[PDB]
Amino acid sequence: APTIIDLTCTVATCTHSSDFGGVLTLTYKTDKNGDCSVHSHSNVATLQEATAKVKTAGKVTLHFSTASASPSFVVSLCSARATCSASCEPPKDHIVPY
Amino acid sequence: APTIIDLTCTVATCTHSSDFGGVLTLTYKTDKNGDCSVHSHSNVATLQE
Amino acid sequence: RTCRIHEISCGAHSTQCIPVSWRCDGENDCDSGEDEENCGNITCSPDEFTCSSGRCISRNFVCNGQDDCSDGSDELDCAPPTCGAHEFQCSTSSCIPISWVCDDDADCSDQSDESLEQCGR
Amino acid sequence: YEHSTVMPNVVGFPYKAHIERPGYSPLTLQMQVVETSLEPTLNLEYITC
């Protein structure tokens, strides 16, 4: 498994809508390129994908959907951890077919 | 015109004679290379060029 | 650096070692896209550019100043760099004012500005 | 995405509007009044010659 050190999390945009209306960016430092299993440890926010490609560049992105005004959840990438908190604005569409 | 920053002026040799008896050196940092205009703002010393 | 027993090198000039699973996986994991070259026959892959002719060239041959697509599609929508409309390019690739070409001073580090071929002397 | 603004009634003035959607990158429009025309409503009274 790749060794992940100093993992930080920031949220680009958030909108608590039924579709996946969140963009999440992770910074990390690695030694080798591999595959990590990404999970979120709360049901306030639901990630879209299960595995991500970690590269020597030091940036991966994830998509999450949330329904709370201000989420706060702990996301893990292989063995690392972080705390992401964001501010989300309501969506404008009244009704959706999904 | 080229942009000049951090101008420092040093004098190597001087001799107050009738002909141009001084040598002047300027160090700077520029972004591009081109032509500047050189002038001395006091009449105590007159530049040749 | 010899790559580990389960890693492959991204070409003879790359220090990048990708997992053997990342060769022909449909993502450009190599800096050159060489991992996606020579996979599905000619089947264009993520490290290859699709010519308008239907040919696959390496993405490294897009905007290299050569017609590798044989239809010039690889040289369409690029961005060629040079000196400005008032600058002369030295053979060392430095730009000088056109006013400093053939002025009997060596403003180019290689004297290209004072070159007998350029000055028409 | 509904939006509203107020733009001056000056011919040739290059009005630019900034639309900043929460989920997307901001956008800038440009609106310009090339020509204006004010039409009254007329009721003929009589004719003289």
Side-chain angles (χ1 to χ4, degrees), chain C residues 91-111:
Chain C
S91 92
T92 49
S93 64
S94 49
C95 299
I96 62 167
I98 286 172
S99 51
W100 296 1
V101 181
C102 313
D103 74 5
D104 297 299
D105 298 324
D107 295 299
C108 295
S109 42
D110 63 3
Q111 310 180 346

mmCIF file with all atom_site columns, all heavy atoms in Angstrom, chain C residues 91-111:
data_model
loop_
_atom_site.group_PDB
_atom_site.id
_atom_site.type_symbol
_atom_site.label_atom_id
_atom_site.label_alt_id
_atom_site.label_comp_id
_atom_site.label_asym_id
_atom_site.label_entity_id
_atom_site.label_seq_id
_atom_site.pdbx_PDB_ins_code
_atom_site.Cartn_x
_atom_site.Cartn_y
_atom_site.Cartn_z
_atom_site.occupancy
_atom_site.B_iso_or_equiv
_atom_site.pdbx_formal_charge
_atom_site.auth_seq_id
_atom_site.auth_comp_id
_atom_site.auth_asym_id
_atom_site.auth_atom_id
_atom_site.pdbx_PDB_model_num
ATOM 1   N N   . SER C 1 91  ? 20.432 32.830 -32.605 1.00 0.00 ? 91  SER C N   1
ATOM 2   C CA  . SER C 1 91  ? 20.461 31.375 -32.827 1.00 0.00 ? 91  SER C CA  1
ATOM 3   C C   . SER C 1 91  ? 20.487 30.578 -31.512 1.00 0.00 ? 91  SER C C   1
ATOM 4   O O   . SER C 1 91  ? 19.989 29.454 -31.461 1.00 0.00 ? 91  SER C O   1
ATOM 5   C CB  . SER C 1 91  ? 21.576 30.982 -33.805 1.00 0.00 ? 91  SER C CB  1
ATOM 6   O OG  . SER C 1 91  ? 22.802 30.651 -33.200 1.00 0.00 ? 91  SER C OG  1
ATOM 7   N N   . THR C 1 92  ? 20.946 31.206 -30.424 1.00 0.00 ? 92  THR C N   1
ATOM 8   C CA  . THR C 1 92  ? 20.812 30.757 -29.025 1.00 0.00 ? 92  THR C CA  1
ATOM 9   C C   . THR C 1 92  ? 19.410 30.926 -28.430 1.00 0.00 ? 92  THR C C   1
ATOM 10  O O   . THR C 1 92  ? 19.229 30.663 -27.244 1.00 0.00 ? 92  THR C O   1
ATOM 11  C CB  . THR C 1 92  ? 21.840 31.463 -28.122 1.00 0.00 ? 92  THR C CB  1
ATOM 12  O OG1 . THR C 1 92  ? 21.822 32.852 -28.349 1.00 0.00 ? 92  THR C OG1 1
ATOM 13  C CG2 . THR C 1 92  ? 23.254 30.941 -28.362 1.00 0.00 ? 92  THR C CG2 1
ATOM 14  N N   . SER C 1 93  ? 18.401 31.308 -29.222 1.00 0.00 ? 93  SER C N   1
ATOM 15  C CA  . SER C 1 93  ? 16.987 31.512 -28.846 1.00 0.00 ? 93  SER C CA  1
ATOM 16  C C   . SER C 1 93  ? 16.677 32.683 -27.897 1.00 0.00 ? 93  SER C C   1
ATOM 17  O O   . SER C 1 93  ? 15.529 32.831 -27.485 1.00 0.00 ? 93  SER C O   1
ATOM 18  C CB  . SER C 1 93  ? 16.297 30.195 -28.446 1.00 0.00 ? 93  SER C CB  1
ATOM 19  O OG  . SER C 1 93  ? 16.845 29.605 -27.285 1.00 0.00 ? 93  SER C OG  1
ATOM 20  N N   . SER C 1 94  ? 17.644 33.561 -27.612 1.00 0.00 ? 94  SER C N   1
ATOM 21  C CA  . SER C 1 94  ? 17.387 34.857 -26.966 1.00 0.00 ? 94  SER C CA  1
ATOM 22  C C   . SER C 1 94  ? 16.764 35.861 -27.943 1.00 0.00 ? 94  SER C C   1
ATOM 23  O O   . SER C 1 94  ? 17.074 35.841 -29.133 1.00 0.00 ? 94  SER C O   1
ATOM 24  C CB  . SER C 1 94  ? 18.668 35.418 -26.330 1.00 0.00 ? 94  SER C CB  1
ATOM 25  O OG  . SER C 1 94  ? 19.764 35.397 -27.221 1.00 0.00 ? 94  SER C OG  1
ATOM 26  N N   . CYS C 1 95  ? 15.899 36.744 -27.445 1.00 0.00 ? 95  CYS C N   1
ATOM 27  C CA  . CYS C 1 95  ? 15.285 37.813 -28.231 1.00 0.00 ? 95  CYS C CA  1
ATOM 28  C C   . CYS C 1 95  ? 15.972 39.148 -27.928 1.00 0.00 ? 95  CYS C C   1
ATOM 29  O O   . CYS C 1 95  ? 16.088 39.519 -26.761 1.00 0.00 ? 95  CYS C O   1
ATOM 30  C CB  . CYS C 1 95  ? 13.780 37.870 -27.936 1.00 0.00 ? 95  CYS C CB  1
ATOM 31  S SG  . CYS C 1 95  ? 12.855 36.362 -28.344 1.00 0.00 ? 95  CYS C SG  1
ATOM 32  N N   . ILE C 1 96  ? 16.396 39.866 -28.965 1.00 0.00 ? 96  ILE C N   1
ATOM 33  C CA  . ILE C 1 96  ? 16.917 41.237 -28.874 1.00 0.00 ? 96  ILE C CA  1
ATOM 34  C C   . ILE C 1 96  ? 16.021 42.184 -29.688 1.00 0.00 ? 96  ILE C C   1
ATOM 35  O O   . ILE C 1 96  ? 15.367 41.730 -30.624 1.00 0.00 ? 96  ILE C O   1
ATOM 36  C CB  . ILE C 1 96  ? 18.390 41.323 -29.328 1.00 0.00 ? 96  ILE C CB  1
ATOM 37  C CG1 . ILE C 1 96  ? 18.560 40.922 -30.807 1.00 0.00 ? 96  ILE C CG1 1
ATOM 38  C CG2 . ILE C 1 96  ? 19.289 40.480 -28.408 1.00 0.00 ? 96  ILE C CG2 1
ATOM 39  C CD1 . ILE C 1 96  ? 19.929 41.296 -31.365 1.00 0.00 ? 96  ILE C CD1 1
ATOM 40  N N   . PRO C 1 97  ? 15.956 43.488 -29.390 1.00 0.00 ? 97  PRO C N   1
ATOM 41  C CA  . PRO C 1 97  ? 15.351 44.492 -30.269 1.00 0.00 ? 97  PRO C CA  1
ATOM 42  C C   . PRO C 1 97  ? 15.807 44.379 -31.732 1.00 0.00 ? 97  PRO C C   1
ATOM 43  O O   . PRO C 1 97  ? 16.997 44.264 -32.004 1.00 0.00 ? 97  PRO C O   1
ATOM 44  C CB  . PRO C 1 97  ? 15.824 45.816 -29.662 1.00 0.00 ? 97  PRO C CB  1
ATOM 45  C CG  . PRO C 1 97  ? 15.849 45.509 -28.169 1.00 0.00 ? 97  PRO C CG  1
ATOM 46  C CD  . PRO C 1 97  ? 16.448 44.107 -28.168 1.00 0.00 ? 97  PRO C CD  1
ATOM 47  N N   . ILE C 1 98  ? 14.898 44.492 -32.713 1.00 0.00 ? 98  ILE C N   1
ATOM 48  C CA  . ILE C 1 98  ? 15.281 44.528 -34.150 1.00 0.00 ? 98  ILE C CA  1
ATOM 49  C C   . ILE C 1 98  ? 16.228 45.701 -34.447 1.00 0.00 ? 98  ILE C C   1
ATOM 50  O O   . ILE C 1 98  ? 17.005 45.641 -35.397 1.00 0.00 ? 98  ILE C O   1
ATOM 51  C CB  . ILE C 1 98  ? 14.028 44.564 -35.068 1.00 0.00 ? 98  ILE C CB  1
ATOM 52  C CG1 . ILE C 1 98  ? 13.365 43.173 -35.088 1.00 0.00 ? 98  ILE C CG1 1
ATOM 53  C CG2 . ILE C 1 98  ? 14.336 44.981 -36.524 1.00 0.00 ? 98  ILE C CG2 1
ATOM 54  C CD1 . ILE C 1 98  ? 12.013 43.122 -35.814 1.00 0.00 ? 98  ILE C CD1 1
ATOM 55  N N   . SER C 1 99  ? 16.180 46.771 -33.648 1.00 0.00 ? 99  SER C N   1
ATOM 56  C CA  . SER C 1 99  ? 17.101 47.905 -33.772 1.00 0.00 ? 99  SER C CA  1
ATOM 57  C C   . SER C 1 99  ? 18.559 47.568 -33.459 1.00 0.00 ? 99  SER C C   1
ATOM 58  O O   . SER C 1 99  ? 19.411 48.371 -33.819 1.00 0.00 ? 99  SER C O   1
ATOM 59  C CB  . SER C 1 99  ? 16.654 49.055 -32.867 1.00 0.00 ? 99  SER C CB  1
ATOM 60  O OG  . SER C 1 99  ? 16.417 48.619 -31.543 1.00 0.00 ? 99  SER C OG  1
ATOM 61  N N   . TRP C 1 100 ? 18.823 46.440 -32.794 1.00 0.00 ? 100 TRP C N   1
ATOM 62  C CA  . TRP C 1 100 ? 20.156 45.961 -32.405 1.00 0.00 ? 100 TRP C CA  1
ATOM 63  C C   . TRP C 1 100 ? 20.689 44.881 -33.355 1.00 0.00 ? 100 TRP C C   1
ATOM 64  O O   . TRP C 1 100 ? 21.665 44.206 -33.084 1.00 0.00 ? 100 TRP C O   1
ATOM 65  C CB  . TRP C 1 100 ? 20.090 45.453 -30.963 1.00 0.00 ? 100 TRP C CB  1
ATOM 66  C CG  . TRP C 1 100 ? 19.775 46.453 -29.890 1.00 0.00 ? 100 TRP C CG  1
ATOM 67  C CD1 . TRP C 1 100 ? 19.520 47.773 -30.050 1.00 0.00 ? 100 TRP C CD1 1
ATOM 68  C CD2 . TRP C 1 100 ? 19.779 46.223 -28.453 1.00 0.00 ? 100 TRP C CD2 1
ATOM 69  N NE1 . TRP C 1 100 ? 19.241 48.347 -28.824 1.00 0.00 ? 100 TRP C NE1 1
ATOM 70  C CE2 . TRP C 1 100 ? 19.415 47.440 -27.799 1.00 0.00 ? 100 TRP C CE2 1
ATOM 71  C CE3 . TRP C 1 100 ? 20.086 45.118 -27.635 1.00 0.00 ? 100 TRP C CE3 1
ATOM 72  C CZ2 . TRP C 1 100 ? 19.310 47.540 -26.406 1.00 0.00 ? 100 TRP C CZ2 1
ATOM 73  C CZ3 . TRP C 1 100 ? 20.001 45.209 -26.234 1.00 0.00 ? 100 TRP C CZ3 1
ATOM 74  C CH2 . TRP C 1 100 ? 19.596 46.408 -25.621 1.00 0.00 ? 100 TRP C CH2 1
ATOM 75  N N   . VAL C 1 101 ? 20.014 44.666 -34.485 1.00 0.00 ? 101 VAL C N   1
ATOM 76  C CA  . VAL C 1 101 ? 20.487 43.733 -35.506 1.00 0.00 ? 101 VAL C CA  1
ATOM 77  C C   . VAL C 1 101 ? 21.384 44.493 -36.472 1.00 0.00 ? 101 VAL C C   1
ATOM 78  O O   . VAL C 1 101 ? 20.901 45.398 -37.161 1.00 0.00 ? 101 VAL C O   1
ATOM 79  C CB  . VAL C 1 101 ? 19.302 43.071 -36.222 1.00 0.00 ? 101 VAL C CB  1
ATOM 80  C CG1 . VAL C 1 101 ? 19.734 42.053 -37.283 1.00 0.00 ? 101 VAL C CG1 1
ATOM 81  C CG2 . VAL C 1 101 ? 18.417 42.322 -35.231 1.00 0.00 ? 101 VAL C CG2 1
ATOM 82  N N   . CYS C 1 102 ? 22.639 44.066 -36.597 1.00 0.00 ? 102 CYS C N   1
ATOM 83  C CA  . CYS C 1 102 ? 23.635 44.627 -37.513 1.00 0.00 ? 102 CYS C CA  1
ATOM 84  C C   . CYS C 1 102 ? 24.095 46.035 -37.142 1.00 0.00 ? 102 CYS C C   1
ATOM 85  O O   . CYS C 1 102 ? 24.263 46.882 -38.036 1.00 0.00 ? 102 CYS C O   1
ATOM 86  C CB  . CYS C 1 102 ? 23.147 44.534 -38.960 1.00 0.00 ? 102 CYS C CB  1
ATOM 87  S SG  . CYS C 1 102 ? 22.488 42.918 -39.365 1.00 0.00 ? 102 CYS C SG  1
ATOM 88  N N   . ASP C 1 103 ? 24.261 46.290 -35.850 1.00 0.00 ? 103 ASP C N   1
ATOM 89  C CA  . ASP C 1 103 ? 24.739 47.571 -35.332 1.00 0.00 ? 103 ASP C CA  1
ATOM 90  C C   . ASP C 1 103 ? 26.228 47.569 -34.949 1.00 0.00 ? 103 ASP C C   1
ATOM 91  O O   . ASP C 1 103 ? 26.723 48.566 -34.422 1.00 0.00 ? 103 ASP C O   1
ATOM 92  C CB  . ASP C 1 103 ? 23.775 48.125 -34.279 1.00 0.00 ? 103 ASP C CB  1
ATOM 93  C CG  . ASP C 1 103 ? 23.804 47.431 -32.925 1.00 0.00 ? 103 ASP C CG  1
ATOM 94  O OD1 . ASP C 1 103 ? 24.642 46.543 -32.703 1.00 0.00 ? 103 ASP C OD1 1
ATOM 95  O OD2 . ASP C 1 103 ? 22.999 47.887 -32.079 1.00 0.00 ? 103 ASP C OD2 1
ATOM 96  N N   . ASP C 1 104 ? 26.957 46.525 -35.362 1.00 0.00 ? 104 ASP C N   1
ATOM 97  C CA  . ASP C 1 104 ? 28.382 46.281 -35.111 1.00 0.00 ? 104 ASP C CA  1
ATOM 98  C C   . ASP C 1 104 ? 28.719 45.949 -33.633 1.00 0.00 ? 104 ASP C C   1
ATOM 99  O O   . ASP C 1 104 ? 29.897 45.717 -33.335 1.00 0.00 ? 104 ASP C O   1
ATOM 100 C CB  . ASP C 1 104 ? 29.282 47.355 -35.785 1.00 0.00 ? 104 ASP C CB  1
ATOM 101 C CG  . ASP C 1 104 ? 29.219 47.413 -37.331 1.00 0.00 ? 104 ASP C CG  1
ATOM 102 O OD1 . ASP C 1 104 ? 29.552 46.419 -38.024 1.00 0.00 ? 104 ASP C OD1 1
ATOM 103 O OD2 . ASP C 1 104 ? 28.984 48.478 -37.959 1.00 0.00 ? 104 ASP C OD2 1
ATOM 104 N N   . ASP C 1 105 ? 27.720 45.822 -32.740 1.00 0.00 ? 105 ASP C N   1
ATOM 105 C CA  . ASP C 1 105 ? 27.864 45.308 -31.372 1.00 0.00 ? 105 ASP C CA  1
ATOM 106 C C   . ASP C 1 105 ? 27.289 43.886 -31.249 1.00 0.00 ? 105 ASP C C   1
ATOM 107 O O   . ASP C 1 105 ? 26.264 43.550 -31.822 1.00 0.00 ? 105 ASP C O   1
ATOM 108 C CB  . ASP C 1 105 ? 27.159 46.204 -30.347 1.00 0.00 ? 105 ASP C CB  1
ATOM 109 C CG  . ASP C 1 105 ? 27.684 47.634 -30.226 1.00 0.00 ? 105 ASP C CG  1
ATOM 110 O OD1 . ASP C 1 105 ? 28.916 47.841 -30.359 1.00 0.00 ? 105 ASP C OD1 1
ATOM 111 O OD2 . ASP C 1 105 ? 26.840 48.500 -29.879 1.00 0.00 ? 105 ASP C OD2 1
ATOM 112 N N   . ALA C 1 106 ? 27.943 43.024 -30.470 1.00 0.00 ? 106 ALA C N   1
ATOM 113 C CA  . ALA C 1 106 ? 27.472 41.659 -30.237 1.00 0.00 ? 106 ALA C CA  1
ATOM 114 C C   . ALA C 1 106 ? 26.465 41.597 -29.073 1.00 0.00 ? 106 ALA C C   1
ATOM 115 O O   . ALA C 1 106 ? 26.851 41.281 -27.943 1.00 0.00 ? 106 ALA C O   1
ATOM 116 C CB  . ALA C 1 106 ? 28.697 40.770 -30.004 1.00 0.00 ? 106 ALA C CB  1
ATOM 117 N N   . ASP C 1 107 ? 25.186 41.857 -29.341 1.00 0.00 ? 107 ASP C N   1
ATOM 118 C CA  . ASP C 1 107 ? 24.093 41.756 -28.365 1.00 0.00 ? 107 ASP C CA  1
ATOM 119 C C   . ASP C 1 107 ? 23.598 40.309 -28.197 1.00 0.00 ? 107 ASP C C   1
ATOM 120 O O   . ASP C 1 107 ? 23.192 39.892 -27.106 1.00 0.00 ? 107 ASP C O   1
ATOM 121 C CB  . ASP C 1 107 ? 22.937 42.688 -28.766 1.00 0.00 ? 107 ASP C CB  1
ATOM 122 C CG  . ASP C 1 107 ? 23.335 44.167 -28.705 1.00 0.00 ? 107 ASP C CG  1
ATOM 123 O OD1 . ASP C 1 107 ? 23.694 44.639 -27.605 1.00 0.00 ? 107 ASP C OD1 1
ATOM 124 O OD2 . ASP C 1 107 ? 23.182 44.892 -29.701 1.00 0.00 ? 107 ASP C OD2 1
ATOM 125 N N   . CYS C 1 108 ? 23.686 39.486 -29.245 1.00 0.00 ? 108 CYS C N   1
ATOM 126 C CA  . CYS C 1 108 ? 23.517 38.045 -29.109 1.00 0.00 ? 108 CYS C CA  1
ATOM 127 C C   . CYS C 1 108 ? 24.782 37.395 -28.526 1.00 0.00 ? 108 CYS C C   1
ATOM 128 O O   . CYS C 1 108 ? 25.900 37.583 -29.005 1.00 0.00 ? 108 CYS C O   1
ATOM 129 C CB  . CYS C 1 108 ? 23.142 37.392 -30.439 1.00 0.00 ? 108 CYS C CB  1
ATOM 130 S SG  . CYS C 1 108 ? 21.537 37.833 -31.155 1.00 0.00 ? 108 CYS C SG  1
ATOM 131 N N   . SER C 1 109 ? 24.596 36.493 -27.560 1.00 0.00 ? 109 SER C N   1
ATOM 132 C CA  . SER C 1 109 ? 25.685 35.706 -26.948 1.00 0.00 ? 109 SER C CA  1
ATOM 133 C C   . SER C 1 109 ? 26.499 34.862 -27.946 1.00 0.00 ? 109 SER C C   1
ATOM 134 O O   . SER C 1 109 ? 27.627 34.467 -27.651 1.00 0.00 ? 109 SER C O   1
ATOM 135 C CB  . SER C 1 109 ? 25.117 34.806 -25.839 1.00 0.00 ? 109 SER C CB  1
ATOM 136 O OG  . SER C 1 109 ? 23.890 34.183 -26.206 1.00 0.00 ? 109 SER C OG  1
ATOM 137 N N   . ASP C 1 110 ? 25.940 34.589 -29.122 1.00 0.00 ? 110 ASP C N   1
ATOM 138 C CA  . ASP C 1 110 ? 26.565 33.871 -30.236 1.00 0.00 ? 110 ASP C CA  1
ATOM 139 C C   . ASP C 1 110 ? 26.888 34.759 -31.453 1.00 0.00 ? 110 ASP C C   1
ATOM 140 O O   . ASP C 1 110 ? 27.321 34.229 -32.475 1.00 0.00 ? 110 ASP C O   1
ATOM 141 C CB  . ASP C 1 110 ? 25.651 32.706 -30.623 1.00 0.00 ? 110 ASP C CB  1
ATOM 142 C CG  . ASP C 1 110 ? 24.280 33.168 -31.127 1.00 0.00 ? 110 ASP C CG  1
ATOM 143 O OD1 . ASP C 1 110 ? 24.004 34.377 -31.255 1.00 0.00 ? 110 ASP C OD1 1
ATOM 144 O OD2 . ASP C 1 110 ? 23.453 32.303 -31.455 1.00 0.00 ? 110 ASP C OD2 1
ATOM 145 N N   . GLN C 1 111 ? 26.702 36.083 -31.348 1.00 0.00 ? 111 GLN C N   1
ATOM 146 C CA  . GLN C 1 111 ? 26.887 37.058 -32.430 1.00 0.00 ? 111 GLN C CA  1
ATOM 147 C C   . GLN C 1 111 ? 25.972 36.806 -33.647 1.00 0.00 ? 111 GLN C C   1
ATOM 148 O O   . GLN C 1 111 ? 26.346 37.078 -34.790 1.00 0.00 ? 111 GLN C O   1
ATOM 149 C CB  . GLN C 1 111 ? 28.380 37.179 -32.809 1.00 0.00 ? 111 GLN C CB  1
ATOM 150 C CG  . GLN C 1 111 ? 29.282 37.390 -31.584 1.00 0.00 ? 111 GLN C CG  1
ATOM 151 C CD  . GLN C 1 111 ? 30.766 37.518 -31.900 1.00 0.00 ? 111 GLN C CD  1
ATOM 152 O OE1 . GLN C 1 111 ? 31.279 37.220 -32.968 1.00 0.00 ? 111 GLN C OE1 1
ATOM 153 N NE2 . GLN C 1 111 ? 31.547 37.931 -30.928 1.00 0.00 ? 111 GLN C NE2 1
#
